[PDB]
């Protein structure tokens, strides 16, 4: 939902701010990369003939096989204020956003780009040994800080405030420490560019003027930039957030020139194998992956034993499992990490037996677990034995007259989120204390 979250934030952004964002070719290129192939086809079809088209022509062109994705593309196209659907002359005249259109046209023709590609200095240096290594150093420091092992190079103060204010790595000052939330463990499980998107989403959510379109345009040309070159130090807010993301380790800046590392391209797009972990009924780990980061993240929920060059070993204990469960880590998160670290031999055998049993029957008189459950279900039954309860504390009523208070003040209460427990035939249903706003008036009336 990453591009979906981006599109959602853009639709939250009001129409004229969006149109201000559609002014420049680099931003329009980034949004062009965001949109699905159908909407991309629509805008490239429209960009070279300036004719408002009725919707019925689009309906004639579209084969109904991709009609659902067509509707998704045009619904995003309309809600992003990028389409102008008006039923002029009775039929829905369709129009692409004109600022977006001309900026895409200039980007494609190589016309007026206003250095939205980048205000270049073009005094390039080596990036493998300076930029990549500085990026790796700073990002290693923040990754081990997000692991929880002590490390000297702490993050910056504004991103420390980001971790404090945000629900991501809650810096619990009563305990005095940063703490992994369940949202923090989801953040850990996220892809690298997903993590980048999470960081910028929280930072833009909390930052206020620091102009909003300055953030948007600057970030979009930051994604549009290339590697290993010097560039001119742009707006003032863009420059101060440029120095901020320099402190993030994103750019190697020599205090007007700056050298964007591999992370700009990582933000632009992504990139017995590495990370293929042999599961065991013995609950012993033969990982096909070794890093200090790997040991750092695996120590949170595994008793480990020793590190070799690719195979760091140890043992899963139920104490480690309960440690993870008490860390706020979801059992779903743990098992999701387990499919991210599955191994080819067991995968091949599971596929062969999957085809073998689907040749017999789909039911098989057993619960469904495609990966070998002897490592998994033993944890998963203990993971089923993790929570296994539910507690209501607060207001509670009982012994109703009839079912008059369950199909309209409990079904519509289900549509608004005010009750906690729904039991129609017991004549008792539990509500939250804060969610007593609109439960107890139609009960009175």
């Amino acid at each position: 939902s990453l591009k979906h979250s981006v599109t959602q934030y853009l639709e939250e952004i009001p129409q004229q701010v969006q149109n201000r964002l559609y002014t420049s070719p680099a931003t329009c290129l980034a949004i062009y990369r965001i949109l699905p192939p159908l909407a991309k086809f629509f805008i490239m079809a429209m960009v070279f003939n300036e004719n408002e088209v009725p919707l019925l022509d689009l309906d004639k062109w579209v084969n109904s096989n991709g009609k659902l994705q067509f509707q998704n593309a045009i619904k995003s196209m309309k809600s992003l204020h990028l389409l102008i659907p008006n039923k002029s002359s009775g039929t829905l005249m369709i129009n692409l956003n004109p600022t977006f259109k001309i900026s895409l046209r200039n980007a494609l023709t190589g016309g007026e780009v206003q250095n939205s590609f980048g205000v270049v200095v073009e005094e390039n240096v080596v990036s493998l040994d300076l930029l990549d290594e500085y990026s790796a150093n700073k990002w290693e420091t923040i990754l081990h800080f997000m692991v929880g092992t002590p490390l000297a190079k702490i993050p910056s103060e504004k991103v420390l405030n980001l971790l404090k204010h945000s629900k991501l790595m809650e810096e619990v000052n009563s305990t005095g420490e940063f703490k992994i939330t369940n949202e923090g463990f989801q953040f850990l499980l996220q892809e690298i560019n997903s993590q980048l998107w999470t960081l910028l989403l929280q930072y833009l959510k909390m930052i206020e003027t620091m102009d909003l379109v300055d953030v948007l345009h600057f970030i979009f040309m930051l994604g549009a930039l290339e590697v290993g070159k010097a560039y001119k130090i742009l707006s003032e807010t863009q420059r101060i957030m440029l120095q901020d993301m320099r402190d993030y380790g994103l750019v190697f800046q020599k205090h007007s020139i700056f050298y964007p590392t591999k992370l700009a391209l990582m933000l632009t797009s992504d990139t017995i194998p590495d990370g293929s972990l042999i599961v065991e009924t013995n609950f012993k780990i033969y990982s096909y992956s070794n890093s200090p980061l790997q040991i750092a993240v695996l120590s949170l929920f595994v008793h480990l034993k020793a590190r070799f060059v690719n195979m760091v070993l140890g043992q899963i204990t139920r104490e480690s499992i309960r440690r993870a469960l008490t860390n706020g880590i979801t059992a779903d998160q743990i098992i999701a990490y387990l499919e991210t670290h599955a191994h080819p031999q067991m995968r091949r055998l599971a596929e062969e037996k999957l085809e073998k049993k689907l040749e017999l029957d789909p039911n098989c008189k057993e619960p469904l677990q495609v990966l070998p459950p002897t490592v998994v279900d033993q944890i998963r039954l203990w993971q089923l034995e993790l929570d296994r309860v539910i507690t209501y504390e607060g207001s509670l009523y009982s012994d109703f007259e009839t079912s008059q208070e369950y199909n309209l003040l409990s079904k519509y209460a289900q549509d608004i989120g005010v009750l906690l427990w729904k039991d129609d035939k017991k004549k008792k249903f539990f509500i939250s204390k804060e969610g007593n706003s609109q439960v107890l008036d139609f009960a009175k009336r």
């Binding site: 104490e319 309860v389 507690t391 209501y392 509670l396 012994d399």
Partner: protein, 66 residues
């Protein structure tokens, strides 16, 4: 004519009997019982009996592995 505040927990017969054992080794804490999946407890001592439930399964298994 009865609608009184209490902490209602969806429960099990076994942990219900454990709550009665809590009452046994220190009485008059838990208030009333509806069925095996509904008991009513002192809302002040909900966390007291939560940590006692924690030590209850600690006594149940205790999983040494040393």
């Amino acid at each position: 004519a009865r609608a009184r505040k209490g902490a209602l927990v969806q429960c099990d017969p076994s942990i219900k009997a454990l709550i009665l054992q809590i009452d046994a080794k220190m009485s008059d804490i838990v208030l009333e019982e509806l069925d095996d999946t509904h008991l009513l407890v002192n809302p002040s001592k909900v966390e007291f009996v939560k940590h006692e439930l924690n030590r209850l399964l600690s006594k149940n298994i205790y999983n040494p592995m040393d």
